[PDB]
Subunit: 75 residues, 3 copies
Amino acid sequence: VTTATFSIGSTGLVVYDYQLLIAYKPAPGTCCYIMKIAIPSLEALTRKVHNFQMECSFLGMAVSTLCGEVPLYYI
Amino acid sequence: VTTATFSIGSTGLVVYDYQQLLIAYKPAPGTCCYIMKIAPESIPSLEALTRKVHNFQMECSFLGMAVSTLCGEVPLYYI
Amino acid sequence: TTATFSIGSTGLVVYDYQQLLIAYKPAPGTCCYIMKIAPESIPSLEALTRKVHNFQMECSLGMAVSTLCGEVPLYYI
């Protein structure tokens, strides 16, 4: 199963690794929030990001590309 | 399952599901999803799909994991 | 397997880990930059964004790469 990447807002990016985890990166050069999944919609993830104020403030090929050179916060 | 996601315009998002041979397009958050079937021999480039979206006036006026993530909570229109 | 990301306002990238190549398109109807990558040193999205900006790559194959780059010239760099 090829992972799904999505854009959130103007600079935000998400990687759904159906590894069973989600990686959210608010903007270039900030950070990555790593969440384990048991699967929320893209719209539900966008609200959660804002509600939990996720603004910074061995995982798979796709998550390593997105989150390489930035700190990882496992939540 | 072999799929790919892309951006279109200011807010548009697209999912190409090469296995199921379908395309899901969402013009913006909270709007709708257009589901299209594709012929196995004529998968359209991103440019071709951008023109098709304009030509069909896709302005919102079973499926895989990636399509369900994109289109959860909005109405689906088959074209 | 493959992964797609956005760079700036209109830029799009396809990472093709199976064919060990990167396809960057700076805007619709421009061109695609095709780059070869070493399996032991795949560049991060951060590093590719810098490569794209520093070399001013403004245009002056698998399923996902063909979809992104169909209809525009390819520059192998």
